[PDB]
């Protein structure tokens, strides 16, 4: 029975490969060869935010494009105002090994997580004036790598026991569990319409998941080593990923194959974060060579370098109105660029 | 800015004040990372240290001679180990009167010879010596080890060989290795960890003035 099943798997894989190779009639660099380059783009630091005691691991913008949240090793979570460089909140944690944070879309809640395998949900707008815990969600086996919101009552989590989960908050119970990866899960990203989401999981493989039905729909391969970051193009039918072999790749979902590759011969380090711009014409990458790089998405060249950090860049993000870019690194400073 | 932003300035400054205090204490703390398969030995040593002072990650804190010490005491370990970049020493505990030695040597070789632990010293504890005394009184023939001396005799020739075996599998020298055979009195253990950390910090200090 084993031999027949293995042969069936091989035949199905060959069929999938043939189906993918059938429709590759054109190359993205062949239609974009007649388009004006964006020229040289340069950005000056406009604000500088200081106060952390150690390295910075994550950040997240808001929806009004004026408030920020950041997480550091010292067990601190800080809420900033970016127009006037003010501190609005300073929240102490319970476990000092933190690795991610998220900011709710209505503006009432935040999230935290790390090596304690628990996800903590915090309430901002109370009547006693303080900031107090609201939920401690538990049930995973290994550490957590990412967490994002859907509405004021639902969370998605990705954890390095090869698992993803959807949680309802009021009860505290799991609702659906996504399984099928072989290694640790490293990054996840949500769609604008809030019905599907993508995850990349440290085994040179990425997958698309249907949040409602409960099973995977498509899988993509191609990298040579593990995958560290992921995000959506701002229309819900494209995404782009970064690995630990100095290569970025742009994938499609309605054709089920890779489209482009961003790389250079002078780069040997890894990639720690990726984000898009508002029209899909700028892609931003943070590296370990002490810098951030600014690429044109549609022709794979270089357009800018944002220098100014003394250590590795860990996090970078873009607003919901398009005005700024925020970068945070291991020297415990945040910077805003326009 | 008028009549409310001014107030919103004061609040911000107050937060800074508290942070400025915290940095004055974090600078004084010594971090030590603890590993070992001897669950009983680890539990006993931890209980003794707690009595002196009085799963995920279980951090313990104590003080020896007015210096603050913190011990972390923890599948892809490569990403798990990136968060301990500011350590000073790794404390590795080994069972002796058991076998289980070749596996412990393999784990030692995997742990010490890593990229991210170049500037860290290794303290090595050998536990349960009384049972080893009993088991060397009733000699068990060494299966394969070339225990050239005193094989049908006391361990005092065996532990030289065991120390030599632990001394190898180290491909990056210029950071010392300290030995120990545990004793019931815990003052010895406290004194040993104190002096190992002090010697390491002095050797780091003499570099910055270009010795």
């Amino acid at each position, epitope marked *: 029975e084993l031999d027949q099943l293995r042969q069936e798997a091989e035949q199905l894989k060959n069929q999938i490969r043939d189906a993918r190779k059938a429709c590759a009639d054109a190359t993205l660099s062949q239609i974009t060869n007649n388009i004006d380059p964006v020229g040289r783009i340069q950005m000056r630091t406009r604000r500088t935010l200081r106060g952390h005691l150690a390295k910075i691991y994550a950040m997240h913008w808001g929806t009004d494009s004026r408030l920020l949240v950041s997480a550091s090793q010292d067990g601190k979570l800080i809420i900033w105002d970016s127009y006037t460089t003010n501190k*609005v909140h300073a929240i102490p944690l319970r476990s000092s090994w933190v690795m991610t944070c998220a900011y709710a879309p209505s503006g009432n809640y935040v999230a935290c997580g790390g090596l304690d395998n628990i996800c903590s949900i915090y309430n901002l707008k109370t009547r*006693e*004036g303080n900031v107090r815990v609201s939920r401690e969600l538990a049930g995973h086996t290994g550490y957590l790598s990412c967490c994002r919101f859907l509405d004021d009552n639902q969370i998605v989590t990705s954890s390095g026991d090869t698992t993803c989960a959807l949680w309802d908050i009021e009860t505290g119970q799991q609702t659906t569990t996504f399984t099928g990866h072989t290694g640790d899960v490293m990054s996840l990203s949500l769609a604008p319409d809030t019905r599907l989401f993508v995850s990349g999981a440290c085994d040179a493989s990425a997958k698309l998941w249907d949040v409602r039905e409960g099973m995977c729909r498509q899988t993509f391969t191609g990298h040579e080593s593990d995958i560290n970051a992921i995000c959506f193009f701002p229309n819900g039918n494209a995404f782009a990923t970064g690995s630990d072999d100095a290569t970025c790749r742009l994938f499609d979902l309605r054709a089920d194959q890779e489209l482009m590759t961003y790389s250079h011969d002078n780069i040997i380090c890894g990639i720690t974060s990726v984000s898009f711009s508002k029209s899909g014409r700028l892609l931003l990458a943070g590296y370990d060579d002490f810098n951030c790089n600014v690429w044109d998405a549609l022709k794979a060249d270089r357009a800018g370098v944002l220098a100014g950090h003394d250590n590795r860049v860990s996090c970078l993000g873009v607003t919901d109105d398009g005005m700024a870019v925020a970068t945070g690194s291991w020297d415990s400073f945040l910077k805003i660029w326009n | 800015l008028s*009549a409310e932003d001014k107030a919103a300035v*004061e*609040r911000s400054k*107050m937060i800074d004040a508290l942070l400025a205090r915290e940095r004055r204490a974090v600078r004084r703390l010594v971090k030590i990372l603890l590993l070992g398969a001897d669950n009983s030995g680890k539990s006993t040593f931890l209980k003794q240290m707690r009595i002196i002072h009085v799963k995920g990650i279980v951090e313990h804190d104590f003080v020896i001679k007015k210096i603050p010490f913190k011990m972390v005491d923890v599948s892809q370990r490569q990403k798990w180990f990136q968060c301990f970049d500011g350590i000073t020493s790794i404390l590795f505990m080994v069972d002796s009167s058991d076998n289980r030695l070749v596996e412990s040597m393999n784990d030692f070789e995997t742990i010490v010879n890593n990229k991210l632990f170049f500037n860290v010293s290794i303290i090595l504890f050998l536990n349960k010596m009384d049972l080893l005394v009993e088991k060397v009184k009733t000699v068990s023939i060494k299966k394969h080890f070339p225990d050239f001396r005193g094989d049908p005799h006391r361990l005092e020739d065996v532990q030289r060989y065991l120390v030599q075996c632990f001394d190898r599998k180290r491909r990056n020298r210029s950071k010392p290795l300290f030995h120990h055979f545990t004793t019931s009195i815990d003052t010895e253990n406290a004194r040993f960890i104190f002096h190992a950390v002090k010697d390491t910090i002095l050797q780091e200090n003499l570099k910055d003035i270009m010795l």
Partner: single-chain antibody
Amino acid sequence: VQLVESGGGLVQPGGSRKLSCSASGFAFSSFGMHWVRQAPEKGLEWVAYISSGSGTIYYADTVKGRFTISRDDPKNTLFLQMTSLRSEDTAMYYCVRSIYYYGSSPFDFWGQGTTLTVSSDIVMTQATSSVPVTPGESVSISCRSSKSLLHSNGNTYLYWFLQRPGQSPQLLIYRMSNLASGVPDRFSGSGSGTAFTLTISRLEAEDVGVYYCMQHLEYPLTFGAGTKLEL
């Protein structure tokens, strides 16, 4: 969330007095505190202000040098110390909480007051004093200023409060457009520089009382006369 204050009474001229306020149910050390005043049958008048950290302190112009304010954080208690009392210091005194950061809603809780009896500034004016009403209809009120309240940063510092017959004020509109917590969604407010109007739709009983409009653009704070709805 509870403020209880004490100290009132009848005093002979001269003399001195010390009034106190006790908080219960919130984080007293992250809030600023105000003392406000109400005449026997007239509009409100602002008295004094102390802030977090015991730094900035502000007084008014008609009592300056005689009053003094203090706070005690570990026991959560405010003190007002007043000396050399005249015949014009006969009124009700009230305590008010406030907090200032991006998005906060100051003046969000008031106490129940105490009685005390004895044997340049921006001017704002109320439109009228009374309006005959009938349940089920719509109503609007207006008050007028004497300078622009629109600061350059995009704000507008005007407040609308309500006081029912026998109670303490409750916030209705802060910064000229926004709704306080715990209020029906039938209220609204609008205005242009130096002219403002509150609007109520689908009137209901227990909405009868006296309404008030305040400014906060720069110290000192100044009130209006007060408008009344008679059912």
